[PDB]
With several copies, the nearest count.
Chain A
Amino acid sequence: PVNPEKLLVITVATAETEGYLRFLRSAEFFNYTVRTLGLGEEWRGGDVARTVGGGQKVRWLKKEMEKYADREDMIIMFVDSYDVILAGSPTELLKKFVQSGSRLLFSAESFCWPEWGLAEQYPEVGTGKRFLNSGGFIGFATTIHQIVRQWKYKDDDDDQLFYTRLYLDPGLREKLSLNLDHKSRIFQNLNGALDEVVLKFDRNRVRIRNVAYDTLPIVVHGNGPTKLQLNYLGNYVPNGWTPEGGCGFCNQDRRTLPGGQPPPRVFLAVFVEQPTPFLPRFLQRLLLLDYPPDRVTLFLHNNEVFHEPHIADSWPQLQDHFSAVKLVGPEEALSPGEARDMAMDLCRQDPECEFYFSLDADAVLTNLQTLRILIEENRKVIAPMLSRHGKLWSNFWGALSPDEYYARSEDYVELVQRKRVGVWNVPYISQAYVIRGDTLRMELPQRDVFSGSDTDPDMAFCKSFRDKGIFLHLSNQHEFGRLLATSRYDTEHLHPDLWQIFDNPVDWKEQYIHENYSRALEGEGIVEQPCPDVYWFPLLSEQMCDELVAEMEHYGQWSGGRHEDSRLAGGYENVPTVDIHMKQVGYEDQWLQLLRTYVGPMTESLFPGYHTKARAVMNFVVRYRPDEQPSLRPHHDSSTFTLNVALNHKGLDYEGGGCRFLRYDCVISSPRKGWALLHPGRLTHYHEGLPTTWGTRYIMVSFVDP
């Protein structure tokens, strides 16, 4: 029945790092009484775990212990403060200590770090660990007083070997009742026992379990090269994310931009490389962000001569928008690492940047509030969650292989599909991030972060950030955007973007398909029935029309007109037209895909009970000119129904007429640029073409389901 108030927590930490804050949060979760030593004092040691060290905490605790040299009734425990996260309540800890009944319990470890020779001197242990680790201990104040009063060495002396030598004395160990926790009852060192720990969820809290010994530890000390694994473990224990209650320390600690002052200055950046499709859309989208232009400093670094005309066209609009606008053209012959590094240094040497916000070329931000929410988060580093459409490829990583390469974690499939929501600790981010300026200034002062080795610049950047001890958070609470596909982007066309129908269908539809199509499909009117069994619904936007006529005029070869044919297997056209079939241009497969995806459902909803697979063999674009060819004679079409789409605006470019249904006395006189005509053409509908008078007109015709 030990009272909880007799236990005092003692930790040492020179500075205040994010790890120390995490430990403080974990300790405060179970109302622990923590006293910190060496707060602000210089680290008179050296490398934390490279070869040796730890000779200053002993001196500090020897100076501290003089106040409690006689407090027998008090129980004191010491522990690291940078890679330790508490998990259990004090009551169970003191209960376990009472059950052990020793005077000083040390955390046991698997290997002998400082020396190897003294291994045989250790008393034998059945199943658990045998050696001693200096990661912490629990003991009476008099006992620790006696054991550590004997310290008289240099401040740079190693620590664990002194404890090992003191423990190895048999008589003193018997007198001091020194014991080791071999079966992981209190302390669990993640080094060497990575496979003996599993996460045991609960309702409103989380814990860890040692499967090998079937016990629940209280303190975990992820020492050694296990920073990644303990950092992963810190996402849940003890209040990270439980199924009942969402996220924990994920909603508080927000700036909320109060005061009405001009919002903190932002140094935007753009790195257009590996030529990115749909560039003009992103350049246009660069303006409509929800942040005042006077507080936005742009830096557009190009690396492609191919994309030079687009940036040149867009440049004046940006120049009028932002307070400061700069360009670095492709002629500088600058590798991406240099670009990122001098952008980083340009902000780093300008005290007026407070959040250096990179944004790569292939990251479309469909949410216009990304900057506001991310800045409100006030994380040291933070990235938004973007994933390819209908895949698993995201912009972060779960865990790193021993080769420092992409492995697969366990929760990654959860996080990519938003089954879990919060702000997650992550060992690699890219393609969009928000870094705090102070971290740039007094935390990353060296210049060479992206260059300096053979590794990729991004991996080098995250590796540099990992060793310095800086967290790389990541949030996916809302929806932020999607990553484009630049695996293959041919550029041997006037508008090579038109071939991107397979690669990025959603943005292709957004740019190209007429904006009124979806509303018409879901059934709020729009579609018209000028004559029975005839329908008028808009399909294409103006960009499709103008880029298509541009491509076809680039080809230029206007074959057709003769009553015979070689493109036809039969070799005898019922009626000839001057036409360019999609087969010779190489665009036919994309057109069949478009018919399959964006026309089929329209016809199925328009004609109930009809089922289609959208097969088309003959598809072409016909030009009507008053001098080349007149309109067609009355005839019939060799297909179930015919899709008829105009390609240029009537009046502004040409004057004429549309279709003429003989059996119904129907005349179509005003074709629209972005609309399509659907009508059966086998039996019921005898149609004739009206003659063009002035100008030149283009019409797209296809025969589906022959």
Chain B
Amino acid sequence: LIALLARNAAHALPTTLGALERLRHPRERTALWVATDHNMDNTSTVLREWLVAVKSLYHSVEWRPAEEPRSYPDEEGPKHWSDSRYEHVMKLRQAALKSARDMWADYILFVDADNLILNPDTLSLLIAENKTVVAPMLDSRAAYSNFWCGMTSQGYYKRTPAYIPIRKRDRRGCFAVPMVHSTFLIDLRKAASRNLAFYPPHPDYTWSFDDIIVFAFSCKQAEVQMYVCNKEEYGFLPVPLRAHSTLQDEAESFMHVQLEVMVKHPPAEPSRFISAPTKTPDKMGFDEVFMINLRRRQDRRERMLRALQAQEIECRLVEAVDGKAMNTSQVEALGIQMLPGYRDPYHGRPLTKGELGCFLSHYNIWKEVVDRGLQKSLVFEDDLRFEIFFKRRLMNLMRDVEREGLDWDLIYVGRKRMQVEHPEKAVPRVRNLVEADYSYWTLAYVISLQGARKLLAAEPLSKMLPVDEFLPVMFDKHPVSEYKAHFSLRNLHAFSVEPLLIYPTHYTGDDGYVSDTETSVVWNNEHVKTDWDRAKSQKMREQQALSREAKNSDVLQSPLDSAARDEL
């Protein structure tokens, strides 16, 4: 029996139901006891359509819809978990357990309506463990997952040394755990399974009245060990939002879950028997969104275009000069001259053709920005990842910057900080903003028309550097005084966002890491090709060095970027 309780899950249901439909189990040997209640959205309609379409494929479908009321009177909001709600959910779980018992059904899987069970073999794998209660370990964007390894005495999370080794799958195995939740299988064929109940708390139950804690106590009193299995990667789930969060925040969280799925896997295809809501992309209030992509790259292009359509972000595709395909006569006709005495600080080279092509691509973007008078433009590389609520948080920040006014030129939004020391000074009255220091990974930044004019007036073509060396020079933050000495106009007002919104898709040394910028020939000659030296690649990710005493406490944070429940 596959069970499913759904409330306000319309944003998630299309992908989740397609995933359930993709489970390789014979549908004539499955059932469904889908119930839905207290819906404020069209969830009941979407579920009814699906069940009507699939009804002939499964052995039986029991449908118990309740369209009204949409909320409890004792609820403060859609994310409030009142006692009446907990009691009702416990009654529903008990009724599902009874339904499972009356048809003598082999096992019950209580799938939560927001769990994306993406691995089609999840059922056959969990069945083979021959456990009375076993949960698939679900992955999330954080340390959150569908299990706890420890409880103190009141049933709250207790950090244990086993959690991190389990969470990283450094130790693979079915592990005894004091609690599993959300997705778990109960084997009803085992005799001990008869004494488990969720509705009547145990007479000796004296802990907090919570639906996940009461069932764990029942399991404990029945001497049923709840095992958790992490042998495979089974699937993903969203992180519980805060009580005052909206249904829009939940929908954006699930969308971010789908984006994270799309980071390492093919997209989770929706059910073909369910419609999909129309998305209406906008440019988030930017004047232009540029996307830099190599003509030879299409996997990343397609992925990024899908990720942008997912977030409803309109962008203008910007082609790029393939400097590796550039010959000397083309470089000379463009007047490109290397900065005299330039040497890569880590290896000992003049430059690469790839860095030249990148630089000329940015120069061409800056030129177009100037020629069109674009007040604010966004520039993307192709291997970005999104933070939660990216679009709304960025638009709120940029609206605050504009309303409070600022002569900013290159507020960094995503970078690798190379100067790891005392915190940078927060900009007064501007929230989530610091003065930028020396930075690597100039993957994306917003630039104003004034900044672009200053950069063009710097005449950078006669003194070409990589963008991540040129930019710290332009804000007078370059550590090497000789390079600043090579230039004269250093008036870029550069700031940085504290909570960066963009990170690399892959770090140096990650599986699948490929750099079209680093793995290019030297600007001159053709026999000097530089391969990526795994030993020399250094700035893999400016994050492990960061677990140091950089403070950063004093930046005015936004209410956004708030998540986690008692499992973080």
A and B touch in their complex, CB below 8 angstroms: yes
**Chain A residues within CB distance 8 Å of chain B:** 195-196, 211-212, 214, 408
Selected from A195, A196, A214, the residue in CB contact (under 8 A) with B171 is: A214
Cβ of B544 within 8 Å of any chain A Cβ, yes or no, is no
Encode contact with A along B165-209: 1 for CB under 8 Å, 0 otherwise.
100000100000000000000000000000000000000000000
Q: Which chain B residues numbered 367 to 399 have a C-beta less than 8 Å away from chain A? A: none
Closest chain B residue, CB of each to CB of A417: B204
Query: Would A408 and B161 count as touching, CB distance under 8 A?
Result: no
**Which are the 9 A-B pairs with shortest beta-carbon distances?**
A212-B161, A211-B162, A211-B161, A196-B161, A214-B171, A211-B160, A408-B153, A195-B161, A212-B162
Contacts of B161 in A (CB 8 A): 195-196, 211-212
Using an 8 Å CB-CB cutoff, how does the interface string of B284-310 with A read, 1 for contact, 0 for none?
Answer: 000000000000000000000000000
Task: Determine chain A's interface SS by DSSP, over half rule.
Answer: loop
Can you list 7 A-B contacts with CB-CB less than 8 angstroms, sorted by A residue number? A195-B161, A196-B161, A211-B160, A211-B162, A212-B161, A214-B165, A408-B153
Q: How far is the CB of A430 from chain B (nearest CB, A)?
A: 24
- Determine the chain A residues whose CB is within 8 A of the CB of B160 once the complex forms: 195, 211
Contact residues of B between 135 and 178, Cβ < 8 Å to A: 153, 160-162, 165, 171
B171 cross-chain contacts in A, Cβ below 8 A = 214
Instruction: Kindly name the residue among B153, B160, B161, B171 whose own CB sees the greatest number of chain A CB atoms within 10 A.
Output: B161
CB-nearest residue of chain B relative to A214?
B171
How many chain B residues sit at the interface, stated as a range, is under 10
Residues of chain B with a CB closer than 8 A to A408's CB:
153
Task: Determine how close the nearest CB of chain B comes to the CB of A389; give it in whole angstroms.
Answer: 17
Residues of A near B162 (CB, < 8 A) are 211-212
Q: Given contacts A212-B161, A214-B171, could you give 10 more A-B pairs where the C-beta distance is less than 8 Å?
A: A195-B160, A195-B161, A196-B161, A211-B160, A211-B161, A211-B162, A212-B162, A212-B165, A214-B165, A408-B153
Task: Among A196, A211, A212, A408, find the residue whose CB has the most chain B CB atoms closer than 10 A.
Answer: A211
Contacts of B153 in A (CB 8 A): 408
Which residues of B241-275 have CB atoms within 8 Å of chain A's CB atoms?
A: none
Q: Which of B's residues lie within 8 Å of A, judged by CB?
A: 153, 160-162, 165, 171
Min CB distance, B172 to chain A, in Å? Answer: 11
Please give me the residue from chain A that is nearest to B223 by CB atom. Answer: A243
Q: Which residue of A lies closest to B171 (CB)?
A: A214
Number of A-B contacts (CB under 8 A): 12
Cβ distance A392 to chain B, nearest Cβ, rounded Å: 10
Q: Smallest Cβ distance from A406 to chain B, in angstroms?
A: 14
Chain A residue nearest in CB terms to B162: A211
Q: B165: which A residues are within 8 A, CB to CB? A: 212, 214
> Of all chain A residues, which has the CB nearest B158?
A195
Task: For residue A212, give the distance in angstroms from its CB to the closest CB of chain B.
Answer: 4
Chain B positions within 8 Å of A214 at CB level: 165, 171
Please name the residue on chain B nearest to A410 by beta carbon. B153
Separation in Å of the A694 CB from the closest CB of chain B? 58
Cβ-closest chain A residue relative to B160: A211
Q: How far is the CB of A227 from chain B (nearest CB, A)?
A: 23
Shortest Cβ distance from A409 into chain B, in angstroms?
Answer: 10
Chain B residue nearest in CB terms to A212: B161
Would you give the shortest CB distance from A211 to chain B, in whole angstroms? 4
Given the complex, which residues of B lie within 8 Å of A212, measured CB to CB?
161-162, 165
Q: Which residue of B lies closest to A211 (CB)?
A: B162
Q: Say how far B206's CB is from chain A's closest CB, in angstroms.
A: 9
CB-nearest residue of chain A to B206: A413
Q: Which residues of B contact A196 (CB under 8 A)?
A: 161
In this complex, what residue of A is CB-closest to B163?
Answer: A211
Shortest Cβ gap from B176 to chain A (Å): 9
Write the chain B residue with the least CB distance to A195. B161
Shortest CB-to-CB span from A239 to chain B, Å, is 22
Q: Which residues of B contact A195 (CB under 8 A)?
A: 160-161
Distance of B203 from chain A, by nearest CB (Å): 12
Residue of B nearest to A210 (CB): B161
- Nearest CB in chain B: distance from A407 CB, A: 10
- Chain B nearest CB from A128 CB (Å) reads 12
Q: How far is the CB of A197 from chain B (nearest CB, A)?
A: 10
When C-beta atoms are compared, the residue in chain B nearest to A392 turns out to be B206
Chain B residues, CB < 8 A from A211? 160-162
**Nearest residue, chain A, Cβ from B170:** A214
Nearest residue, chain B, Cβ from A200 = B176
Smallest CB–CB gap between B162 and chain A, Å?
4
- Taking the closest CB of chain A, its distance from the CB of B147, in whole angstroms, is 15
CB distance from B222 to the nearest CB of A (A): 15
B153: nearest chain-A partner, CB-CB = A408
User: Separation in Å of the A387 CB from the closest CB of chain B?
Assistant: 15
Q: Closest residue to A243 on the B side, CB-wise?
A: B223
Within the complex, what minimum Cβ distance (angstroms) separates A110 from chain B? 14
- Least CB distance from B192 to A in Å reads 15
Shortest Cβ distance from residue A463 to the other chain B in the assembled complex, whole angstroms? 26
A314 to chain B, nearest CB (A): 42
**Which residue from chain A places its CB closest to the CB of B159 in the assembled complex?**
A195
